[PDB]
Design a protein around this ligand. Structure first.
Ligand SMILES: CC1[C@H](O)CC(=C/C=C2\CCC[C@]3(C)[C@@H]([C@H](C)CCCC(C)(C)O)CC[C@@H]23)C[C@H]1O
Lengths: 242, 11
């Protein structure tokens, strides 16, 4: 069974997610509006969407048990490299297989393959991204596993630039062990079949998605007129080599 | 380096 610390960690991560993920998407009204007619007409809306999502990712990250014991530099490294990955992961909540799209409450805020294209990205990212979303959906994760996965994703010792790798590893292992134990104690067969390994694999998928996103973002942002359409937080986190 | 906004949001 799950220890009291493990139950504690789960309760903390659930609450941290509830406080940083608004399932009514009510804040989407504050973003630059979506335009669907290239011009890259979806870049101002989606730039704001990602920018907003970074802030929420940070808010969640601060509440991860053990995260606060890291230096602020390492906090920075972990967030800079993981943010795109956790946005893709957390976006699974809005993703729907009915039509292979992210459904955020309304037609304006429903984003399909071509909306993402209209933000400067190609099928080289979008196709594996959608495939990720599908493979992830099909795990039918408990909300508890989802929040653990986002946490394990953030606290990853192999991230480039990490100083106190040992301490990051110890923090991850504690979450990892909470995940494995949660799966054995609270996820019934058959759904729990090789579930941990399938979740770790999704983190491997995210590393490729991350790399590909970095290449396309690099190319997108070099062009000063695209960079003009981004936010200052997106430039800071993803890069501003323009 | 220089990540003032990320830093601020962190504490
Ligand atoms: C708020 C919340 C909801 O689930 C909605 C949501 C959707 C995420 C999506 C669908 C639109 C396209 C997104 C933003 C992906 C594209 C590849 C990111 C583009 C960013 C940029 C243009 C700055 O390079 C990442 C994850 C995708 C984010 C999630 O944080």
């Amino acid at each position: 069974k799950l220890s009291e610390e493990q139950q504690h960690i789960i309760a903390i991560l659930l609450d941290a997610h509830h406080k940083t993920y608004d399932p009514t998407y009510a804040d989407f009204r504050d973003f630059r509006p979506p335009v669907r007619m290239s011009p890259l007409s979806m870049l101002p809306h989606l730039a704001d969407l990602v920018s907003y999502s970074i802030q929420k990712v940070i808010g969640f990250a601060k509440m991860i048990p053990g995260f606060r014991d890291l230096t602020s530099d390492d906090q920075i490294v972990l967030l800079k490299s993981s943010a795109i990955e956790v946005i893709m992961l957390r976006s699974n909540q809005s993703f729907t297989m009915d039509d292979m799209s992210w459904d955020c409450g309304s037609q304006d805020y429903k984003y399909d393959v071509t909306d993402v294209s209209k933000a400067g990205h190609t099928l080289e990212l979008i196709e594996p991204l959608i495939k990720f979303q599908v493979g992830l959906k099909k795990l039918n994760l408990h909300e508890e596993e989802h929040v653990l996965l986002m946490a394990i994703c953030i606290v990853s010792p192999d991230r480039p630039g990490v100083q106190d790798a040992k301490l990051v590893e110890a923090i991850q292992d504690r979450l990892s062990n909470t995940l494995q134990t949660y799966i054995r104690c609270r996820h019934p067969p058959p759904g729990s079949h090789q579930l941990y390994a399938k979740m770790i694999q999704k983190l491997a998928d995210l590393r490729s998605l991350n790399e590909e996103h970095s290449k396309q973002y690099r190319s997108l942002s070099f062009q000063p007129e695209n960079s003009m359409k981004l936010t200052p937080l997106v430039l800071e986190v993803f890069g501003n080599e323009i | 380096k220089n990540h003032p906004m990320l830093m601020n949001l962190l504490k």
